[PDB]
């Protein structure tokens, strides 16, 4: 156990084995007998030395820490020290001229609260409860079958040891890693590994260099679909192959989303101002020497006026909306932060099987009547049939259905034909369904023609056949139907049924049949041959005892009915909705542990390899020239084999990505998918990963955002993903990548509008030091902007439609073009922010002169004004005001600074609405943002007229004339912004845009 770049890097190289040993090359090596196992004594005794079989999950940092590590989120230092200085200060005042004032002490508890509350909000965000191993550990079994001394005995799977004798039977799961010594008729669901669920065969036939491919290694997690085997255990739990993955996956730092590393960037800027200011005006506070607590009371101000409060959780909420919004398009989001992620994305890596496709072997074409037909490879049956007009079909249907051991599972007439549980395999059932679906029932069509004898598929002869009592009223009685390999089902045919009428199997058709077997399977399809014979009436009368030991009936000159072909096909949306991700400028890449011949064919099918585009190989054979002779940069697309990845270097790879557009990594380790993601990532790009298979986890969990599939996929894949397409619709990746480009804009608007109102909050406290003026805007007054009036109106932009075909622009670029930037701050702070203050002061200047203190006779007062004894202070007339007498006007000055601010925010909330369109181009269809207005505004009122807000908040009722102050200023703000956008739209490369277009 070394560093991570080791303990976790070794978990990344593919493994190496001992299926190449002889049977006596083992024996020694484990000491295990073989006619008869281990001792049971050297068993539990290998247990101690080597230690229990099964995996142990990473520890869990509880719901303490997971929380508090939040209570320091950027603005949360500033917001924390403001409420500490508050608890200071107050103390100071509980020591001098009796000030049992509620004042500051409340600001301490108040502020502190907000810092907490603010954290949750940004915690129900950075959530991530990722129970992965409590998914893998579920694929080992309760008990396992091993033998000892000779006894065969099942036992707790964890009592298997690196050495003993295991007998896997049919259906059940594979306890450890097996090297198969005995073995029988043993096929095995290698899905957890390959990704496909078609059974492979297990023999002791060492066959192959690579331990993933030899038929003499059995694998942890996998299950024995049929047969039986015996094995010596070469790897025990944590130490195995799948286990060495559950490790590598449940071992992966989620890491910064692409969003949360925007928050952790404007924060760095804000906080900046929030100190630079805050300490510029504090050494200078006491360089003119206000008290001590006349500066630490002025920090508490300058802080608060700087930390945006009602934002970092305004943003948490913008997310939680568009999140809970897609979940109605049936796409579930397990990680809020992720609701953004999909949008910022420039590369997708997709598992083919089950994700891109339906993982349902299925009939793609046919060869009735010399013509090639095509059928509906969808899940719902969008497109068209193919025919039946011809009799030839009634005939081929008959064969394909009649000669077939597939039933349906009990109790299933409910579901759609296709989604019904078969009891067959790959082809057989793929054919069963083809028929049942479009040729009436088969539970029926197989009692009409009752089978009298049959010959199941034997590897030697590559054919399968049944003789059936055709029941016609005429009626040769005895229909022989057979299918099998095609090229080897003409050497058994002499005639070719056409539209209804037999004919000679001449040379025209023999060439054109081979002319279609190529075309057809060049589409990466399994192709079958179907043929029948009406058994001469005389030669076999009603009773004939057909035999299947001694052959007995004809096998030649049989009639040839037609070819049928299957495939694992895209799902409906997949193709239309992949080319979508390219109007969006996203790169798609196939990452599949299937075989290259299917891959590239399915690739071209969905559209990851576009028309008229070639690879090297594709070329050599279009110029009959050896390959190492083709200029590799001539090739846009390429298919790469997981067995060349094995020996490649990141760099040859960074080159394979840097230089090709249409890529297909085929047959790939689990590790290997990650090994690719990691290298797409390598150079900046944000990457998504689609999957369904436990074989995926690792990428589905290194993914910038990882998408699983809902019903296909596995406890794992998903429990290791961010999104989870509940309806398995692979178009919700386009929907999602749009909805996520919009939450971006609508998060800039949502922020701007928050930040803009920050400027007419700092400058008051800023002049309070400059022109020793009576404090216009008070602290407790500021926690009414972003916590009160401003919340709702901000939340409201998140609901803002677009301004163009967003899914028509290249994907944003993590490094450049940030969420918050120069051109934006230059606007909420440098521009609209000032104008908001010129209007906010202007009325403080009116509240006071309309009340006496003509502006200038203000440039000093504070020093005296704030004095609780100097009850006798000249205004601008002579009038002498007490303390509470004049303060009740100071607070009356807050109270409608706090408004000219809300009044200006109208004009704001309406130009932080759009960033290019005039408001007459986009209109005000935001039936929520409007609400924010009516609320915002009226809130203020209430906050100013209720019998109480005065004694509670320094909020005093206002006089009609009072509200309309900021008005010219709101309306300026408004007209300034409108004229910006124009310019831009008239000169889109010109100076203005460079400077105001966020």
């Amino acid at each position: 156990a070394k560093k991570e770049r080791d303990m976790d890097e070794l978990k990344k190289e593919v493994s190496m084995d001992d299926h190449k040993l002889s049977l006596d090359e083992l024996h020694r090596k484990y000491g295990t007998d073989l006619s008869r196992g281990l001792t049971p004594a050297r068993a539990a005794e290998i247990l101690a030395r080597d230690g229990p079989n099964a995996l142990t999950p990473p520890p869990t940092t509880p719901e303490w820490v997971k929380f508090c590590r939040q209570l320091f989120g950027g603005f949360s230092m500033l917001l924390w020290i403001g409420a500490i200085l508050c608890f200071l200060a107050y103390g100071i005042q509980a020591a001098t001229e009796e000030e049992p004032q509620n004042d500051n002490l409340y600001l301490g508890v108040v502020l502190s609260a907000v810092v907490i509350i603010t954290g949750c909000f940004s915690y129900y965000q950075e959530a991530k409860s990722s129970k992965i191993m409590e998914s893998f550990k579920n694929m080992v079994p309760q008990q396992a079958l091993v033998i000892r001394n000779g006894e065969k005995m099942s036992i707790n799977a964890e009592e298997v040891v690196v050495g003993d004798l295991v007998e896997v039977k049919g259906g059940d799961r594979i306890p450890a890693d097996l090297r198969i010594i005995s073995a029988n008729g043993c096929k095995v669901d290698n899905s957890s590994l390959t990704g496909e669920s078609e059974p492979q065969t297990r023999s002791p036939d060492f066959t192959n260099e690579n331990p993933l491919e030899t038929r003499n290694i059995a694998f942890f997690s996998t299950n024995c679909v049929e047969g039986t085997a015996r094995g010596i255990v070469v790897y025990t739990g944590d130490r195995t192959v799948m286990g060495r993955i559950a490790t590598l996956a449940s071992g992966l730092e989620g890491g910064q989303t692409p969003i949360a590393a925007e928050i952790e960037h404007f924060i760095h800027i804000i906080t900046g101002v929030a100190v630079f200011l805050g300490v510029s005006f504090f050494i200078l506070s006491l360089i003119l020497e206000y008290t001590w607590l006349e500066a630490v009371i002025f920090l508490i101000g300058i802080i608060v006026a700087n930390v945006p409060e009602g934002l970092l959780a305004t943003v948490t909420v913008c997310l939680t909306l568009t999140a809970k919004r897609m979940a109605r398009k049936n796409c579930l989001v397990k990680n809020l932060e992720a609701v953004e992620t999909l949008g910022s994305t420039s590369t997708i890596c997709s598992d083919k099987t089950g994700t891109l496709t339906q993982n349902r072997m299925t009939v793609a074409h046919m060869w009735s009547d010399n013509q090639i037909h095509e059928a509906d490879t969808t899940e719902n049956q969008s497109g068209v049939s193919f025919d039946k007009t011809s009799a030839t079909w009634l005939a081929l249907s008959r064969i394909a259905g009649l000669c077939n051991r597939a039933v349906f599972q009990a109790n299933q007439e409910n579901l759609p034909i296709l989604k019904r549980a078969v009891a067959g395999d790959a082809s057989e059932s793929a054919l069963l369904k083809c028929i049942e679906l479009c040729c009436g029932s088969v539970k029926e069509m197989r009692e009409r023609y009752t089978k009298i004898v049959e010959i199941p598929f034997n590897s030697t002869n590559k054919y399968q056949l049944s003789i059936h009592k055709n029941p016609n009223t005429a009626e040769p009685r005895h229909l022989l139907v057979m299918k099998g390999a095609p090229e080897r089902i003409l050497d058994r045919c002499s005639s070719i049924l056409i539209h209804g009428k037999e004919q000679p199997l001449d040379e025209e058709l023999k060439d054109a049949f081979q002319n279609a077997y190529l075309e057809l399977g060049g589409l990466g399809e399994r192709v079958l041959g179907f043929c029948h014979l009406f058994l001469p009436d005389e030669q076999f009368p009603e009773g004939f005892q057909f035999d299947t030991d001694d052959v007995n009936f004809p096998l030649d000159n049989l009639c040839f009915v037609g070819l049928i072909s299957m495939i694992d096909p895209p799902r409906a949306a997949v193709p239309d909705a992949v080319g979508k991700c390219r109007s969006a400028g996203i790169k798609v890449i196939m990452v599949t542990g299937d075989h290259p011949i299917t891959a590239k064919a399915i690739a071209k099918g969905v559209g990851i390899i576009s028309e008229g585009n070639e690879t090297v190989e594709d070329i050599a054979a279009r110029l009959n020239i050896p390959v190492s002779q083709v200029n590799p940069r001539d090739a846009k697309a390429c298919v790469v084999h997981g067995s060349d990845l094995k020996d490649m270097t990141s760099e040859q790879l960074d080159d394979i990505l840097k230089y090709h557009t249409e890529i297909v990594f085929a047959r790939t380790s689990p590790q290997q998918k990650l090994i690719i993601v990691e290298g797409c990532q390598r150079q900046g790009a944000i990457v998504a990963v689609t999957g369904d298979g436990v074989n995926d986890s690792p990428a589905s969990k290194k993914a910038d955002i990882g998408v699983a599939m809902g019903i296909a996929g596995s406890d794992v894949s998903k429990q290791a993903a961010d999104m989870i397409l509940l309806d398995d619709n692979f178009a919700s990746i386009v929907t999602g990548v749009e909805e996520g480009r919009l939450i971006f804009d609508n998060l800039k608007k949502s922020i701007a509008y928050t930040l803009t109102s920050n400027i007419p909050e700092i400058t008051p406290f800023l002049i309070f030091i400059i022109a020793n003026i009576p404090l216009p805007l008070g602290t407790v007054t500021i926690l009414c902007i972003d916590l009160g009036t401003d919340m709702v109106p901000a939340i409201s932009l998140a609901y803002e439609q677009a301004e163009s075909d967003i899914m028509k622009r290249q994907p944003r670029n993590p490094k450049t073009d940030k969420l918050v930037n120069e051109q934006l701050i230059s606007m909420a702070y440098g521009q609209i922010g000032m104008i908001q203050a010129l209007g906010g002061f202007f009325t403080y200047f009116v509240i006071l002169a309309e009340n006496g203190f003509l502006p200038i006779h203000l440039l000093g007062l504070r020093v005296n004004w704030d004095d609780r004894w100097i009850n006798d202070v000249e205004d601008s007339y002579g009038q002498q005001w007490t303390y509470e007498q004049r303060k009740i006007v100071e607070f009356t000055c807050h109270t409608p600074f706090f408004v000219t601010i809300v009044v200006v925010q109208w004009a704001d909330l309406v130009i932080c609405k759009t960033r290019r369109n005039s408001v007459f181009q986009q209109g005000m269809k935001n039936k929520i943002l409007i609400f924010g207005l009516f609320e915002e505004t009226a809130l203020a009122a209430f906050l100013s007229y209720c019998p109480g807000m005065g004694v509670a908040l320094r909020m005093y009722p206002l006089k009609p004339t009072w509200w309309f102050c900021a008005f010219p200023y709101s309306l300026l703000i408004f007209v300034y912004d409108e004229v910006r956008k124009l310019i831009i739209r008239r000169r889109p490369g010109g100076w203005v845009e460079k400077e105001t277009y966020y």
């Binding site: 039936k927 609400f931 009516f934 609320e935 009226a938 009122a941 007229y945 209720c946 009609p960």
Partner: peptide
């Protein structure tokens, strides 16, 4: 002043309400 306090409580309350009617306008 008594005539101003009962003055703002109205055009305010007819704004938490018109807002609910613009809100429940399709939700």
């Amino acid at each position: 002043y008594e005539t101003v306090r009962n003055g703002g409580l109205i055009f305010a309350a007819l704004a938490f309400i018109v807002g609910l009617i613009i809100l429940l306008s399709k939700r």
